[PDB]
Amino acid sequence: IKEMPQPKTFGELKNLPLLNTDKPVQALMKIADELGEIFKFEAPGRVTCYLSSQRLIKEACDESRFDKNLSQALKFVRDFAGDGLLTSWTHEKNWKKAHNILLPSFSQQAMKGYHAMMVDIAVQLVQKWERLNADEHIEVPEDMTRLTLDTIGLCGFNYRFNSFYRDQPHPFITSMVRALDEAMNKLQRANPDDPAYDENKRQFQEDIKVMNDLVDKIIADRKASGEQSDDLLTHMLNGKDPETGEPLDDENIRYQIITFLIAGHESTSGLLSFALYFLVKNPHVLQKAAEEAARVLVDPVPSYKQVKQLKYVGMVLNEALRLWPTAPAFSLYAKEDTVLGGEYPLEKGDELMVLIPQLHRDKTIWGDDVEEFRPERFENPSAIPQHAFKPFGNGQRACIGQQFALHEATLVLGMMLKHFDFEDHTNYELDIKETLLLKPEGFVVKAKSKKIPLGG
Numbered sequence: 116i117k118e119m120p121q122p123k124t125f126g127e128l129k130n131l132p133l134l135n136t137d138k139p140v141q142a143l144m145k146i147a148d149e150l151g152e153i154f155k156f157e158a159p160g161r162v163t164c165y166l167s168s169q170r171l172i173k174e175a176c177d178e179s180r181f182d183k184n185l186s187q188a189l190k191f192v193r194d195f196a197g198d199g200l201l202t203s204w205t206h207e208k209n210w211k212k213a214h215n216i217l218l219p220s221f222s223q224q225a226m227k228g229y230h231a232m233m234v235d236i237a238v239q240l241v242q243k244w245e246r247l248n249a250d251e252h253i254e255v256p257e258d259m260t261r262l263t264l265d266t267i268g269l270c271g272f273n274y275r276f277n278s279f280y281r282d283q284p285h286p287f288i289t290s291m292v293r294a295l296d297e298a299m300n301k302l303q304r305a306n307p308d309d310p311a312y313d314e315n316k317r318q319f320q321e322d323i324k325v326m327n328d329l330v331d332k333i334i335a336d337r338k339a340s341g342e343q344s345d346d347l348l349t350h351m352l353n354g355k356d357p358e359t360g361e362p363l364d365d366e367n368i369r370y371q372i373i374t375f376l377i378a379g380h381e382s383t384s385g386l387l388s389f390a391l392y393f394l395v396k397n398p399h400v401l402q403k404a405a406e407e408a409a410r411v412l413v414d415p416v417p418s419y420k421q422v423k424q425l426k427y428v429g430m431v432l433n434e435a436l437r438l439w440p441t442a443p444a445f446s447l448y449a450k451e452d453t454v455l456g457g458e459y460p461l462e463k464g465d466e467l468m469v470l471i472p473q474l475h476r477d478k479t480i481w482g483d484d485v486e487e488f489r490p491e492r493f494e495n496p497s498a499i500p501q502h503a504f505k506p507f508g509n510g511q512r513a514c515i516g517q518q519f520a521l522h523e524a525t526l527v528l529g530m531m532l533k534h535f536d537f538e539d540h541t542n543y544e545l546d547i548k549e550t551l552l553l554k555p556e557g558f559v560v561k562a563k564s565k566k567i568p569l570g571g
């Protein structure tokens with residue numbers, strides 16, 4: 116039974132002067148470097164416990180002792196994501212209901228049914244790049260986000276945002292991204308009720324309405340038509356929860372659709388963008404991955420089967436997730452009083468944060484070379500100890516989109532690697548922007564086409 120390590124407190128400010136930054140996860144990694152696998156962090160009227168080792172995070176992932184906490188960020192996102200899967204407590208009625216109803220639509224097997232829709236948007240990405248003039252370049256996370264938004268729109272509810280046809284995004288996207296940005300800015304806002312933010316508030320409401328109006332209309336149309344698709348909206352209209360018997364009502368179906376776009380677009384765009392960043396910075400890895408792409412993707416359009424074959428591409432992506440997990444933290448609370456790690460008493464309701472990039476640098480698991488990009492770490496992946504690698508969160512509250520994201524990212528990265536040679540034409544210096552997720556801000560490349568045609 117030990118005192119918890121804690122950085123220096125400054126009277127009533129407590130630790131807050133140490134987290135004055137636009138990059139707080141990177142700043143908390145620097146505090147973990149100094150203080151170790153666990154530290155308390157206090158700010159006026161907030162207290163939490165940052166964990167960075169596999170030893171402690173395994174205990175935090177014990178669902179009989181700890182459950183998912185809604186961070187202040189998630190509570191602000193709940194203003195438009197409602198009680199959809201990401202922003203609901205495990206004890207809310209719609210959390211288990213939607214979980215039960217949606218799980219089979221997110222399984223590995225379900226990816227067979229999404230694959231042609233994913234190929235549609237992936238082809239649009241490849242074609243856009245094939246069509247660039249020789250002096251142009253690619254804005255990587257910008258184009259990965261066009262691809263992931265459009266892919267979730269098509270697989271989610273058979274709706275085309277047509278992001279590759281546009282300089283300014285579809286108004287739903289504009290509103291979603293502006294609402295997310297307002298949710299995030301509220302975390303930093305001294306006087307949220309000051310008349311200065313009256314206009315923020317009005318715009319937020321207007322953004323919510325834009326979002327609700329389109330999705331409520333899509334759901335209403337689909338109910339009145341009676342049409343059946345290979346989409347999530349179909350499965351939610353049909354499904355019943357085996358436990359309660361209850362269906363999702365129309366309002367919750369809307370929150371789930373807003374949720375899949377919010378939860379899937381920026382995370383999967385980040386994973387693709389960091390994986391390309393690492394490949395252009397590690398030429399021998401990029402060559403190995405490109406050889407696998409050419410060896411495996413032998414047809415003009417990839418099949419579901421071929422995508423499962425891209426084992427090295429899968430390792431590249433996991434290794435990008437190891438170094439910069441795009442959803443870099445998740446929040447837990449103690450279900451009852453408990454002692455963490457034999458050393459640290461916690462009280463019921465105490466909050467723990469899992470610092471994922473720091474966990475993924477735990478040298479007692481991964482060895483000393485934790486900064487090196489080496490996808491071969493994952494050559495044999497049942498060998499990684501349980502709870503050492505957690506880029507999709509934990510247990511029943513883990514990422515429902517995991518198979519979707521990884522099938523998406525492997526298909527797209529395999530196609531990119533099949534069709535282009537890539538140039539880091541600016542000698543780009545990694546700069547990690549943190550919103551509610553991580554992104555390689557300003558990452559740009561040039562793609563020289565291999566002139567390999569696409570099928571129809």
Ligand code: HEM
Nearest residue numbers: 200201378379382383386442445507508512514515516520
């Ligand atoms: C590489 C891309 C992704 C990563 C790294 C990621 C990561 C995560 C993590 C870390 C959580 C747990 C959050 C928490 O504990 O507070 C989560 C939850 C969730 N994610 Fe993802 N995700 C990704 C892609 C997606 C996609 C594409 C979708 C939807 C199609 C999605 C949908 C969800 C949903 C609905 C939850 C809430 C699950 C539940 O609590 O029942 N995610 N994700």
Ligand SMILES: NCCc1c[nH]c2ccc(O)cc12
Nearest residue numbers: 192377378379382442514551
């Ligand atoms: N599905 C992971 C993306 C994700 C996980 N948690 C989140 C919180 C806020 C947000 O915008 C996005 C996310």
